Design a protein around this nucleic acid. Structure first.
Ligand SMILES: [K+]
Ligand SMILES: [K+]
Ligand SMILES: [K+]
Ligand SMILES: [K+]
Ligand SMILES: [K+]
Ligand SMILES: [K+]
Ligand SMILES: [K+]
Ligand SMILES: [K+]
Ligand SMILES: [K+]
Ligand SMILES: [K+]
Ligand SMILES: [K+]
Ligand SMILES: [Mg+2]
Ligand SMILES: [Mg+2]
Ligand SMILES: [Mg+2]
Ligand SMILES: [Mg+2]
Ligand SMILES: [Mg+2]
Ligand SMILES: [Mg+2]
Ligand SMILES: [Mg+2]
Ligand SMILES: [Mg+2]
Ligand SMILES: [Mg+2]
Ligand SMILES: [Mg+2]
Ligand SMILES: [Mg+2]
Ligand SMILES: [Zn+2]
Lengths: 147, 174, 206, 38, 59
RNA sequence: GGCACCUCGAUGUCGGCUCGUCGCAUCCUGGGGCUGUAGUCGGUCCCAAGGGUUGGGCUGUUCGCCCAUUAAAGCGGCACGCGAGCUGGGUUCAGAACGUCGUGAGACAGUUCGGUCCCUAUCCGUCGCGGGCGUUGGAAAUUUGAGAGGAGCUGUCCUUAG
RNA sequence: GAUAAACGCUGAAAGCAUCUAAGUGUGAAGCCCACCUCAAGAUGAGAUUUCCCAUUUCUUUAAGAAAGUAAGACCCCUGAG
């Protein structure tokens, strides 16, 4: 009958969630956050439409890195100039740019297309307990049982 | 035959103030504070200290001795203190201290100045003798090794800064 | 310490003890502090400096309004100076060449003279091919690279527009300061065409 | 220091230990016997 | 449909895989197209199905 | 060296020039252990690729020998990097000659002199320079720095001190 | 500033010893800065100072279409560093 529901842009209300990264392994935090950004938690999920929620990640500085990842997990980037390979360790990122650490981890877990790049903008990461988004009235997302 | 098991007593009248962590040992020499692991349970009788591990796993057998060694080291420094004695050897190598500042002349084109923090002091009984003194064993030993390290002993004539009584292998060079 | 002036030209001066040294004449009619930036407002500390009075008809209401706080005429060149004592500066204060003293070690910044479209020999100091022996390779930029990438790597240097670049010369010596003439004599040469903007700052390496 | 895949005690005073994940030999008698696996 | 049923199942304290096992135990033949439609359009009915599945899983 | 899998309705072959770029099994410089390390020089192993790493004589040469230097004068990869960028001395097209082989035409198990190097760049790539729109009222200036590029070498003398 | 090799300090596992397991330090022309330049098309499009100031008509609850303009910019012209 071709009656399967399809969400439309603008009809679905996008909620705001706060996730605490404290002592949560980087990847397990990102995996659950990535699903929220995509709308995979809601029955209205529609692959060609953005239906996911907004996520505020607080305390990114206290995200957990198991094993020796703090010193042995290396983030390479190339400037596209010869010999332009640059590297940094995950531990160094956590201390100095913890937004980048969380954003990079979540970026890899989202689709690499227009919609996925759009969904990544709904992520806001803060090192520390406080964020500027009280005007959105975000609600706590408890992820202890989700990781 | 176990450091973690052994009993530590408190000579003279030192008093130890507990907490969730960062135990404190105080006494005539000064005050010390150190942050233990929460897995070694400590008993405090009137004058006897005994630590207690949960199990006999490698991880807990290792740390138990360390806590007892750390806590014991905390005491003997507060109660009697620690020091390192260095006997610099050379035809004209000499030392001298002005306050918390030790200036060495060990053959370099320039003199060497050494600075101590609040918890340590330099005695220098004679200009060929240096004695680090303090309340913490890590700091005293580390500072004592920096003084030795400015000019470590050499094997052909014995010159340099050596620990008093350390064995210094010498080579019968031609 | 810093000031904005214009490059007047080069000459030479005899020092005490008779040595002859080249100097560049920089004329810096007093600069005016137009704005003070602080962490509270801008997130970083700096003073905004104006140099070279400009005719009114050449200015704007937005520009005239900006210099109104300093109570000065429109200024042709406006630049910021960082790492100074902001409290010692305030809007409308004048900065004169006497801030620098003879013997001071300075850094001089300017815009190098334009040279237009130039080949890789002049632009990059590359080597010609031989001029004879059957050569048909004289002023060409050399191989673009190996075969394997199926492309040219970035920073393969070629012909293009030359000059017009910001260049800083470090550790130059202030030889004289003629305050009544608003002139600073700098030993040596500095970038830029005559009449171009020149920025004199106390040497960062000092 | 000897760096070799085969580190073994050379005399009765040599001690085999491990620091930072590497088999090492240390001797208080002969500095020639100092070894690190590699 | 499976992804949408999974989202609705979790909102009822159950994973997709356990729900389909429980519905099978309860002899419910509703297909994934219908379940996904109930998940979106009639959530109360989807909850009633989920409860029957959870009941069947316990038995 | 083996194989014969892409290319024979053609993937241009040595050396050199121009331009480099990468690996590190490091030539120099930096750090270090052991020494049969007195010192000065060294040996050997470890770490280290940031930069640097000469000009001539002979030969088409690569190589190598030599001269004179140098802190050193590293080894390799990139279609033995680079001929729609250059050269064309070498690599036997046609000429000719020598030695040699052949009865011979000819040939090399070899040498010698001489011998046409085409192409107006469409696309990506590279180096420069503009136009458009965006950046959520329209404007004129000043800016932070995500990110990126450049630079990175080293000798000798004096002093400490004969 | 963080490190390599390397050297520790304190220290137990293992009453000893031990640079390590916890704890803590030294350490390279190298790494990250420091120095120079580019740089928000950094669509994540940032910040600061200053200027203009709320017009008319028609449709309309329209982030409407249209018209004079303001600050300002350009066309054009004389030129050059
Ligand atoms: K072929
Ligand atoms: K090469
Ligand atoms: K050596
Ligand atoms: K190098
Ligand atoms: K030659
Ligand atoms: K020749
Ligand atoms: K080829
Ligand atoms: K050619
Ligand atoms: K080609
Ligand atoms: K193409
Ligand atoms: K912008
Ligand atoms: Mg040349
Ligand atoms: Mg020609
Ligand atoms: Mg490619
Ligand atoms: Mg062997
Ligand atoms: Mg076959
Ligand atoms: Mg073809
Ligand atoms: Mg190596
Ligand atoms: Mg080619
Ligand atoms: Mg014959
Ligand atoms: Mg032949
Ligand atoms: Mg001829
Ligand atoms: Zn031995």
């Amino acid at each position: 009958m071709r009656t399967t529901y399809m969400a439309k842009a603008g009809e679905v209300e996008r909620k705001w969630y706060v996730v605490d990264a404290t002592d949560v392994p980087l990847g397990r935090l990102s995996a659950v956050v990535a699903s929220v950004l995509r709308g995979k938690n809601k029955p209205t999920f529609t692959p060609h439409v953005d239906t996911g929620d907004f996520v505020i990640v607080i305390n990114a500085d206290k995200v957990k890195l198991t094993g020796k990842k703090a010193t042995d997990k290396i983030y390479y980037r190339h400037s596209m100039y010869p010999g332009g390979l640059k590297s940094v360790t995950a531990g160094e990122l956590r201390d100095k740019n913890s937004r980048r650490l969380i954003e990079t981890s979540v970026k890899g877990m989202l689709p690499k297309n227009t919609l996925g790049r759009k969904q990544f903008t709904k992520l806001n990461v803060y090192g520390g307990a406080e964020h500027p988004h009280a005007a959105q009235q975000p609600e706590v997302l408890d992820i202890t049982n989700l990781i | 035959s176990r450091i973690g098991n052994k009993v530590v007593v408190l000579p003279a009248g030192v008093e130890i103030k507990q907490d969730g962590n960062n135990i404190t040992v105080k006494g005539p020499k000064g005050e010390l504070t150190r942050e233990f692991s929460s897995d070694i349970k400590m008993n405090i009788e009137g004058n006897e200290v005994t630590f207690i591990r949960p199990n006999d796993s490698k991880e807990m057998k290792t740390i138990h001795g360390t806590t007892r060694a750390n806590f014991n080291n905390m005491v003997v420094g507060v109660s009697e203190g620690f020091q390192k004695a260095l006997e610099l050897i050379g035809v004209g190598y000499r030392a001298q201290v002005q306050g918390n500042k030790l200036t060495l002349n060990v053959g370099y084109s320039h003199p060497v100045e050494m600075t101590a923090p609040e918890g340590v002091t330099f005695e220098v009984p004679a200009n060929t003798q240096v004695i680090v003194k303090g309340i913490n064993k890590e700091v005293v030993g580390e500072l004592a090794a920096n003084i030795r390290g400015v000019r470590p002993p050499e094997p052909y004539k014995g010159k340099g800064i050596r620990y008093v009584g350390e064995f210094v292998r010498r080579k019968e060079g031609k | 310490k810093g000031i904005l002036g214009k490059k007047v030209g080069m000459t030479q001066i005899f020092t005490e003890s008779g040595e002859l040294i080249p100097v560049t004449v920089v004329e810096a009619t007093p600069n005016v502090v137009l704005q003070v930036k602080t962490v509270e407002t801008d997130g970083y500390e700096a003073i905004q400096v104006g140099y070279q009075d400009k005719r009114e008809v050449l200015s704007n209401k937005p520009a005239k309004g900006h210099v109104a706080k300093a109570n000065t005429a429109p200024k042709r060149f406006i630049k910021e100076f960082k790492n100074v004592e902001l409290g010692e500066y305030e809007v409308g204060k004048e900065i004169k060449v006497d801030v620098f003293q003879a013997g001071d070690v300075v850094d001089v910044t300017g815009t190098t003279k334009g040279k237009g479209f130039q080949g890789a020999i002049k632009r990059h100091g590359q080597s010609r091919g031989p001029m004879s022996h059957g050569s048909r390779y004289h002023r060409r930029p050399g191989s673009m690279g190996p075969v394997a990438p199926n492309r040219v790597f970035k920073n393969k240097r070629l012909a293009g527009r030359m000059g017009g670049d910001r260049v800083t010369i470090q550790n130059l010596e202030v030889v004289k300061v003629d305050v009544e003439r608003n002139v600073i004599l700098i030993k040596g040469n500095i970038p830029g065409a005559k009449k171009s903007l020149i920025t004199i700052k106390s040497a960062v390496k000092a | 220091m000897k760096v070799r895949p085969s580190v073994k005690p050379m005399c009765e005073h040599c001690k085999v230990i491990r620091r930072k994940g590497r088999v090492m030999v240390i001797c208080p008698a002969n500095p020639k016997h100092k070894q690190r696996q590699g | 449909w499976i992804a949408r049923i999974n989202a609705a199942a979790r909102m009822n304290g159950l994973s997709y895989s356990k729900l389909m096992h429980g519905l099978k135990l309860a002899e419910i033949d509703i297909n994934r197209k219908m379940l996904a439609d109930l998940a979106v359009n009639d959530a109360a009915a989807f909850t009633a199905l989920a409860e029957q599945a959870k009941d069947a899983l316990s038995k």
